[PDB]
Amino acid sequence: EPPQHPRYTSLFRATIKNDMKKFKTAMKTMGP
Amino acid sequence: MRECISIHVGQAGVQIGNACWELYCLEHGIQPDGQMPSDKTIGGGDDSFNTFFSETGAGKHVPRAVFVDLEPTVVDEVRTGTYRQLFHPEQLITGKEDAANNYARGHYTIGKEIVDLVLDRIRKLADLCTGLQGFLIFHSFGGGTGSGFASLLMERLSVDYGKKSKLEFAIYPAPQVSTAVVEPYNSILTTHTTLEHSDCAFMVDNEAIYDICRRNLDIERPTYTNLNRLIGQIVSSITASLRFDGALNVDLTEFQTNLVPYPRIHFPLATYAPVISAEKAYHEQLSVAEITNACFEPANQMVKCDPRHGKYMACCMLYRGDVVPKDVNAAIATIKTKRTIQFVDWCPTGFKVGINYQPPTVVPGGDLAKVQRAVCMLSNTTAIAEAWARLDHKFDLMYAKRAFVHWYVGEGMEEGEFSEAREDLAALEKDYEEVGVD
Amino acid sequence: GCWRELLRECKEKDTDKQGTISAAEFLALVEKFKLDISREESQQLIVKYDLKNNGKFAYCDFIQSCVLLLKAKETSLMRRMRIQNADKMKEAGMETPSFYSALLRIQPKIVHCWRPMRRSFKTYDKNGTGLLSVADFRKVLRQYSINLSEEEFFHVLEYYDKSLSSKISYNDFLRAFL
Amino acid sequence: MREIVHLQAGQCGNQIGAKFWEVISDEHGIDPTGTYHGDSDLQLERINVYYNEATGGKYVPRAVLVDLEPGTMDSVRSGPFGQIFRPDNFVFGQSGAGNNWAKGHYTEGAELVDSVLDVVRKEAESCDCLQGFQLTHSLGGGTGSGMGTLLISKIREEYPDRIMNTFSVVPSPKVSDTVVEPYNATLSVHQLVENTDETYCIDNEALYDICFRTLKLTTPTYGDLNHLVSATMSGVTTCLRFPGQLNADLRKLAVNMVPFPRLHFFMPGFAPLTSRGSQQYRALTVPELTQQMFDAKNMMAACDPRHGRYLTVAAVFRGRMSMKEVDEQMLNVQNKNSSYFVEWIPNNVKTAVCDIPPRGLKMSATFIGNSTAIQELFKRISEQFTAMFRRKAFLHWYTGEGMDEMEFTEAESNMNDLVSEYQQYQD
Amino acid sequence: MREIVHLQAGQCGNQIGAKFWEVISDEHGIDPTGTYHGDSDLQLERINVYYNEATGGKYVPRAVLVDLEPGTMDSVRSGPFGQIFRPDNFVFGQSGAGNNWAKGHYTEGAELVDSVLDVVRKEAESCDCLQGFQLTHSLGGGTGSGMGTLLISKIREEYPDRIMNTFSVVPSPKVSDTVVEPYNATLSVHQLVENTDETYCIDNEALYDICFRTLKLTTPTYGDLNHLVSATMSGVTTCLRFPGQLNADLRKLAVNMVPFPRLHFFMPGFAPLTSRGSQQYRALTVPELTQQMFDAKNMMAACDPRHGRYLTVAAVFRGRMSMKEVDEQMLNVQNKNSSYFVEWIPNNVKTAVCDIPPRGLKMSATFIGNSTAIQELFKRISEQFTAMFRRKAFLHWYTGEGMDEMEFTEAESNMNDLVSEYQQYQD
Amino acid sequence: NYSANQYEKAYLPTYLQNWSPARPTKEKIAAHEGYTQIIANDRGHLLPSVPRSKASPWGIPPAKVTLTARTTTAADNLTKWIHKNPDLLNACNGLRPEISGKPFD
Amino acid sequence: PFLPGNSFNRNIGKERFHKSQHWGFCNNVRMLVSENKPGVGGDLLYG
Ligand SMILES: Nc1nc2c(ncn2[C@@H]2O[C@H](COP(=O)(O)OP(=O)(O)OP(=O)(O)O)[C@@H](O)[C@H]2O)c(=O)[nH]1
Ligand SMILES: Nc1nc2c(ncn2[C@@H]2O[C@H](COP(=O)(O)OP(=O)(O)OP(=O)(O)O)[C@@H](O)[C@H]2O)c(=O)[nH]1
Ligand SMILES: Nc1nc2c(ncn2[C@@H]2O[C@H](COP(=O)(O)OP(=O)(O)OP(=O)(O)O)[C@@H](O)[C@H]2O)c(=O)[nH]1
């Protein structure tokens, strides 16, 4: 049984999640 | 190819068969000689006429019709008249006696010895028939003689063939007008002997044909000539799909499916909107929205029925001339949005639409206008209870007194037929009604 | 939890087929979980299902009739009843859910993905003809991760078979649970 | 080499295949007769995508027309480009359908499938390698469905390795013309969803609406609407037959588009279509293209995924472009609409760029989208079924043809499956 | 780049849009067709801040126009410039407002809000970077007031970072044409105060008084009145689109003008107006331009700022000048009346020096002031409000729309609070 | 009878020139279930057990008004003088007028 | 050009509209009735 490596936080993780989050900003601005 | 047969029974019929073919030669450009002018379309009888004629190397178009009558008068008249050289002498079948307003006289006393010739001529045309989609059978209900005869010959052809269409036209009993006290009898007899083999029967009331003929035709002394041009225009409209092309095309089998929901009932009603004179039209406009509204005005139906008290089950709209699907669908949407019209909760859609580029024609001496848009509306609705209700109450009272029984029993029938007819119509009332129940 | 929670409530007990569970200890199950049944109805129940297989209460038929079994149709989409009656008719193995404890244990897969398996049956060229081979039956069950022990195979074989091989209609299986 | 044979069914298929073939012929610049005018060597070379050679420089289209009523085909023959099609691929029936799906599906097709299979496989052998076929047809319009059901049914196992692309017209939500069209529709869509890979759904109401919004001409014909749809046809088919830094294979597109086997329904797009004054009132640049194309109203299939959320989007542009403007536009629209796309998958957008435009306009495009905007179409049709089969109205004919309500019930169950399947994944 | 999107609402904006756009166009020297002629290199450079550039030197005005009465639209269409506007932007309706505030705020706009927001979003995306928008309307007129009240409330949450400047004509202190006008005004200002950052007050009476005092020309037109107000608007926008050692930004101006968020109304002012002979009897110099700018007669918004005391002022000087002379001019007036200036802040003037003049006169200027001179308008409208509401007359239409007076309560209360806070600060 | 979608400007009394509103339309329905079993026989005769709307329909004092301020008792009378006419309150195009208004003091 | 919207159909005076019968079945096969046919209302074919 090989243990899957703890997905290394090469930074990113929730940080890159918030990064892409703060570009995904225009939600409604073309069709309401 | 795309072709059908034409059948006319009775003095009641050869009338308007004459009218119809009188028209049908004009728009296609035939001279009453029967040979085409210096221009060239003659041959084995295959050009647009071919759906109604076979102008073989003989050189003459021949209508694909049979005129069967019990009485020599009218057939002799039309033989001596104008169009005999077109006409084919013996398919003008004539008899020696009249059914004398007796359904059983027409069904037993005479029917046996002439149906043989009828069917023989039918088959000797059917052999050359190729497409033979269906028939145009013309008869009546308050028939002087044609009623029982048509019923029995229809039985013969319905049992010999059962894989095609049959179209039925009969002037409906005038509500409060009678030319026969035996009219309720012979009508209901035809009804219960034909309810189970026919395909599509459409009605009309010549009282109302008159009533529009002085509402907007603007004559206080019309004639049968005027009534017959109107109805001939109707038949021309229904056959225009065969005769010409367009964006989209529809057929009789589509009619028989789409209009009637169920067996038994197959009795919708017709209407024609732009019935208008040249003098009236001179300074007014014609177009899709108002012609639709006019064709759905409650008093422009030529049979005494109320949209308001009725409820719709089907509508088919047949447009001829120069139109566009845009305003077509716009008008139909307005129709759906209207409130006075009350469709039953059954039909989500309710409208079979067909279009042809070709504007109808006129006839010299004719009294229609020079119109550019034509619509034929065929509707099935619950508004027709009153007709058969009137018929049954009249019949039940005068059968309770049971006169003219002596006539029928003496000629050799009995009352059991009457009993069956009564229970049939008693069924049909609630048949119309619980389907409306929703 | 009328299905899976009660399934585990049944699993808590350990006694044989005929000795399903004592009526007093099933009343103890009631006090562990008060039930949507009425008091007089439960008073009936504790003997109406001790009628069969000893004075023990029959969760055996109780659970499966209440949730799993349905020997009728549904006007409001039981999702198929695709009209088929071949193997439920002969049915050498009369419905005996204790002898059919497999069905007591295989429900979740079907109750969530009958429709993919509903599809899968006809996907093997069934042509709407009804029955289809026992071998294909078994292999497609193993295909979609429905493991099934040989004793369970024999149970359901007797249930949906009397005479010979036959080909057991798919809806003729489905109406059991679905 | 690989090529496409065309299947044209029903009186809508007649319509659109006629205008469509003349469109393609004029696209490659062939006279209505068949004697070629040499202008563009690349378009001369790529003829073999569709055309089989005839001696002395004349070029047949490898298409098969089929219907029942002869007069429709007679009119098509009389049309401006009739002479281009062959007596060989002209075959039809001796009766009319009456738009009776039962009659077409079992009665009449049974005795013409032999000849139609014969002719299509003859053309297949005449050719060398095939990707698949495309059929043009209706689903509520009777005859086309009544034949195409069996057509696809057989061709499915005749070639389990090819691509069965189909274009069908869809009933109008406001007025469906033929009353039995819903019944015909469900009967078709069962086998359609079971068999096909891809399906294109369009309706004529939206075409009306685009006509009034940009054509402004108030007096079009069904032929003009066919012109639009056949232009979209050609637009998607462009890449195979032309050089460019982009992929062409219908498979290369489908594998990107469809995530799960049950998804087979797709939803078109068109590029700046120019009104009377907009010719000189539009600034023709890629940003405003991107906008006008991916406008919600600019869509024309059924109804706006405005309610729902986009799953996959593909766009093929045609003309002299650069990559970076479309790149920045893709990122702009991606940020512009994140909710309408699913965190399920980012970068659900695929593009392609082919160099040669159509003739006369500078840069154009064609859009295709798969989103959660189709639920309501068959939702609609499903309420019609629940309402009219509530009383077996108009069903005696089908009973007489020999059918049973079974056949309808399995279809309704399948369609419910699809509806729930959408809603579940998209949420 | 930072640009503007221009909005016209109501049957006043109907004219002001025409006059203002023709002012900009003939200032930039483009023919009534739109084909550009190179005259002023620099204005050609900066044209992008207002116009978009089509192909071939054609220039659309990014103006969006809304109305319910299409006849005035017909007139604007017919005018000598109307062909310059795009049909892509003419959003309107089917009926009129009936000059009802309740109707124009709830019923008729409910079905045009969609399209108006769609056009504005299209243009907002099309453009690059926005400072904000300017809205021409009239609080005294119904239709524009209703549409404006709705649209500004929406755009506040749409784009919460920008400058939503509004210009309007407050009704006459002597006769208001419209009789339910005070209701219209109170209900309009109730949302005006919350939403707008800046609003200009103008009065047609004061326009008439200007015509009497300086124009002397007897027979004017409403077009000429619009000419004067267009001069004012052009003046306030002069700074952005040209070079110069001055701070153009409207936000420059806003933070420099407004001490507190409850102060948004401002009073226009224009510079030398000459009579028929004063052109050649008036030696044109800085001290006399300044003196005429600071007149009890030049000022034309509502009434003399004599009653109250000034709070702040901003002046823009357009032409060839020096800065020192305006410096000692403000010194002179500062010492002249240091008693009328507030003691909260010293030296309450912002001066800006635009270089390129208006064509026709060497030097020019413009004035925008904020003083304790609004009590008159709002007090008077308050008494008229209370008088006509002391028997709830004309309330039947509003209640028939569905409108109750509980809202009128907080409306009138808010105007009372604004007046009271004015008093509290200035005294 | 149900409404269309999105393209909601080209289908209105705006083009009917209707001045009596058409019908309450909608785009609002959940996924219906049921195989739609059959309760008719050959004609539209429902089976007796299953119910229908059992022929509930089978087949001037009114004036739109805002109460506003007309004498209180007259307003109370006007309420009845508007209603109590189900014949012109029920069906045959609905035949339904509205009400607005405020009470007195 | 034949781009969409470039076809302003010949929607002017069109009195005749009759359609030929260009195809038939005949005996027991199907083929094209003798080639020489009028077009729509008397049109002439290609060459
Ligand atoms: N077809 C047709 N019907 C007409 C005409 N004029 C009146 N009618 C109606 O058609 C019916 C004609 O039926 P009958 O008079 O019984 O004709 P018949 O049954 O063939 O036999 P006869 O008694 O000899 O006339 C009448 O009831 C009239 O209401 C007409 O010219 N043609
Ligand atoms: N050429 C042509 N086709 C059209 C036109 N308008 C509509 N169509 C479509 O053609 C559709 C169906 O094509 P087919 O499959 O050939 O029709 P079908 O199977 O014979 O059944 P029907 O639609 O009843 O004719 C119809 O439903 C129409 O929607 C048109 O104007 N011209
Ligand atoms: N176009 C135009 N507007 C004028 C004229 N004279 C005065 N106005 C002003 O225009 C103002 C209102 O413009 P809108 O916002 O369009 O008015 P509205 O919403 O239609 O309401 P009403 O003013 O009652 O018509 C009024 O307050 C008038 O003072 C004129 O001659 N032409």
DSSP string, D351-400: EEEES---SSSS-EEEEEEEES-SHHHHHHHHHHHHHHTTTTTT-HHHHH
Sign of CA dihedral D392, D394, D395, D399: positive
Cα–Cα distance measured from residue B275 to residue B253, given in angstroms and rounded to the nearest whole number: 28
Closest chain D residue by Cα to residue A32? D306
Secondary structure (3-state) at E330 = helix
> Do the chains contact at D177 and B258, CB–CB below 8 Å?
no
Backbone φ, ψ for residue B318 (5° rounding)? -120, 110
What the block records as the tokens of D122 is: 């003859």
Check: CB of residue B166 under 8 Å from CB of residue B198.
Answer: yes
**Residue list for the binding site of B for GTP:** 11, 71, 140, 144-145, 179, 206, 228
Of the candidates E222, E311, E227, E315, which has an alpha carbon nearest to the alpha carbon of residue E268?
E315
Per the DSSP assignment, residues forming a β-bridge with C57 are: C21
Amino acid at E177: D
């995306």: which residue's tokens?
A: E125
Sign of CA dihedral B377, B383, B388, B394: negative
Is there an atom of ligand 1 within 6 Å of B12 CB?
yes
Q: Is the CB of B13 under 6 A from ligand 1?
A: yes
Across B129-192, the runs of DSSP E, i.e. the strands, are 134-140, 167-171
Centre of ligand 3 from the C-alpha of residue E140, in Å: 8
Two tokens, residue B307: 């949209």
Burial C72-83 (b: 16+ CB within 10 A, else e): eeeeebbbbbbe
E41: left (phi over 0), alpha (psi -120 to 50) or beta: alpha
Write out the two tokens for E160.
């919460």
Report the alpha-carbon distance of residue E154 to residue E151 in Å, rounded. Answer: 5
G28: Cα within 13 Å, side-chain hemisphere? 0
C vs F, Cβ pairs < 8 A, gives 9
Rounded Cα distance, D274 and D188, in Å: 36
| Helix (H), strand (E) at residue E292 | helix E286-293
In terms of DSSP bridges, do strands B312-321 and B373-381 run parallel, antiparallel, or are they unpaired?
A: antiparallel
User: CB count, 10 Å around CB of D380?
Assistant: 21
E60 interface with D at CB cutoff 8 Å: yes
By the 8 A CB rule, do B271 and B377 touch? yes
Q: What 3 state SS string does E255-266 have? A: HHHCCCCCCCEE
Rounded Cα gap, residues B85 and B278, in angstroms: 34
Contact yes or no for D425/F58 (Cβ under 8 A): no
Contact E19, E227 (CB under 8 A): yes
Contacts of D406 in chain C (CB under 8 A): 82-83, 128
CA atoms within 13 A on the CB side of E28: 27
CA distances from B97 to B69, B109, B189, C115 (A): 10, 10, 21, 73
E strands of B123-212, at which residues? Answer: 134-140, 167-171, 200-204
Which atom, in ligand 2's list, is nearest to the CA of D14? 1
How far is it, in rounded angstroms, from Cα C2 to Cα G27? 73
Name residue E140's amino acid: G
D245-274 residues touching F, CB cutoff 8 A: none
Evaluate whether B148 touches B107 at the Cβ level (below 8 Å): yes
Sequence-distant (≥ 6) Cβ neighbours of residue C99 within 8 angstroms: C17, C93, C155
Q: What distance in Å separates residue C133's CA from the closest CA in chain D?
A: 22
Compute the distance between CA of residue E160 and CA of residue E157 in angstroms, rounded to an integer: 5
D160 burial (CB, 10 Å; 0-12 / 13-18 / 19+) is exposed
CB D169 less than 6 A from any atom of ligand 2: yes
Alpha helices (H) along B260-403: 278-281, 288-295, 325-337, 385-400
CB D60 within 8 A of CB D24: no
Tell me the shortest Cα–Cα distance from D413 to chain C, in angstroms: 6
Buried b (16+ CB within 10 A) or exposed e, B267-304: bbbbbbbbbbeeeeeeeeebebeebbebbbeeebbbbb
The CA distance from B9 to B259, in Å, is 26
Backbone angles phi, psi at E307, to 5 degrees: -60, -45
Mutate to test the interface with E, among D216, D273, D281, D337 (most CBs of E within 10 A): D281
> Could you report how far apart the first and last alpha carbons of chain B are, in Å?
44
Q: Decide: D12 in ligand 2 pocket, CB within 6 A.
A: yes
Residue D104, C-beta contacts closer than 8 angstroms, at least 6 positions apart = D68, D97, D142, D143, D145, D146, D147, D149
Hey, whose CA ends up nearest to atom 25 of ligand 1? Answer: B144
> In 3D, which of B328, B435, B334 has the Cα closest to residue B381?
B435
CB atoms within 10 A of CB A11: 8
Query: Which chain E residues touch A if contact means CB-CB below 8 Å?
Result: 117, 121, 125, 158
Q: Evaluate whether C168 touches C161 at the Cβ level (below 8 Å).
A: yes
**CA–CA distance, D9 with D12 (Å, rounded to integer):** 7
Taking CB atoms and an 8 Å cutoff, what residues of chain G touch B47?
Answer: 18, 20-21, 38
Query: Per the annotation, where are the binding residues of B?
Result: 11, 71, 140, 144-145, 179, 206, 228
Which among E74, E204, E92 has a CA at the least distance from the CA of E140?
E204
Token reading at B137: 């059978």
- Which secondary-structure segment (H or E) carries E245? none
Nearest C-alpha neighbor of F36 from the set D6, D413, E200:
D413
Whole-number Å distance between alpha carbons of D131 and D197: 13
Closest CA to D169 of D10, D22, D298, D306: D10
Instruction: Give B90-94 contacts, CB < 8 A, sequence gap 24+.
Output: B90/B121, B91/B65, B91/B66, B91/B67, B91/B121, B92/B67, B93/B66, B93/B67, B93/B68, B93/B69, B93/B117, B93/B118, B93/B121, B94/B69
Say which of F15, F52, F54 has its CB closest to residue B330: F15
Whole-number Cα distances in Å, F58 to B228, B430, C12, F52, F53: 38, 12, 60, 11, 9
Q: Give which of D187, D241, D194, D232 is closest to D366, Cα–Cα.
A: D232
Q: Is-contact D16 D230, C-beta < 8 A? A: yes
Tell me, using a 6 A CB cutoff, whether residue B324 lines ligand 2. no
Helix axes D405-426, D181-195, angle to 10 degrees: 60
Residue in the block written with tokens 């026992």? C134
Work out the angle between the directed axes of helices B111-126 and B146-160 (0-180°, nearest 10): 50
G14: chain B residues, CB-CB within 8 Å = 357
CA distance F76 to chain B (A): 32
**Residue D351 forms beta bridges with which residues?**
D315
Identify the residue among G11, G14, G16, G18 best suited for mutation to test binding to B, counting B beta carbons within 10 A and taking the highest: G18
The two beta strands, E2-9 and B4-9, are unpaired
- Pick the atom of ligand 1 nearest to B13's CA: 1
Secondary structure of B200-263 in the HEC alphabet?
Answer: EEEEECHHHHHHHHHHCCCCCCCCHHHHHHHHHHHHHHHHHHHHCCCCCCCCHHHHHHHHCCCC
Chains G and F touch (3+ CB pairs under 8 A): no
CA-CA distance, B261 to D397, in Å (whole number)? 10
F and C interact (at least 3 Cβ pairs within 8 A): yes
Mutation target among D276, D280, D285, D306 for the E interface, most CBs of E within 10 A: D280
Give me the half-sphere count of Cα atoms (radius 13 Å) on the Cβ side of residue B433.
Answer: 15
DSSP D33: S
Residue E180, CA atoms < 13 Å, CB-side half-sphere: 18
Alpha helices by DSSP H, E29-81: 41-46, 70-78
**Nearest atom (ligand 1) to Cα of B174:** 29
| CA gap E369, E232 in Å, rounded | 13
Q: Which residues of F touch E404 (CB under 8 A)?
A: 102
Q: Which two tokens stand for residue D332?
A: 């702009």
Q: Which residue has the tokens 């299509």?
A: D120
* Torsion sign over Cα D255, D257, D263, D266: negative
Candidates E301, E376, E287, E274; CA nearest to E336 is E287
Whether E226 has a binding-site annotation, put simply, is: yes
CA dist D256 → D313, D348, D369, E411 (Å):
9, 9, 12, 58
CA atoms of B179 and B186, how far apart (whole Å):
12
Decide: B412 and B108 in contact? Cβ < 8 Å.
yes
Residues of B involved in catalysis: 254
CB-CB neighbors (< 8 A) of C82 in chain F: none
Resolution of this structure in Å: 4.5
Place of tokens 């689903």: D139
Distance CA D77, CA B249 (A): 16
How far is it, in rounded angstroms, from Cα E344 to Cα B410?
125
Give the residue carrying structure tokens 């504005």. E120
| Angle at CA of residue B103, ends B97 and B106, nearest 5° | 30
* Axis-axis angle for helices D405-426, D375-388 (nearest 10): 150
- Is residue E400 less than 8 Å (CB to CB) from chain F? yes
H helix intervals, D128-258 = 142-158, 181-195, 204-210, 222-237, 250-257
CA–CA separation, B236 vs B238, rounded Å? 6
Cα B436 to Cα F59: distance, rounded to the nearest angstrom? 7
DSSP, collapsed to helix, strand or coil, labels residue G12 as: coil
Strand arrangement, sheet containing E310-318: E349-354, E310-318, E364-371
Chain E residue numbers with beta carbons less than 8 Å from the beta carbon of D287 are 126
Return the closest-CA partner of residue D100 out of D416, D380, D399.
D399
CA nearest ligand 2 atom 24, residue: D99
Nearest residue by C-alpha to atom 20 in ligand 3: E143
Contact A29 E158 (CB under 8 A): yes
Q: How many CB atoms lie within 10 A of CB E308?
A: 19
Q: Report the candidate in B116, B192, B104, B201 with the shortest Cα–Cα distance to residue B153.
A: B116
Pairing of strands E63-67, E90-92: parallel
Asked whether the beta carbons of residue D337 and residue A27 sit closer than 8 angstroms, the reply is yes
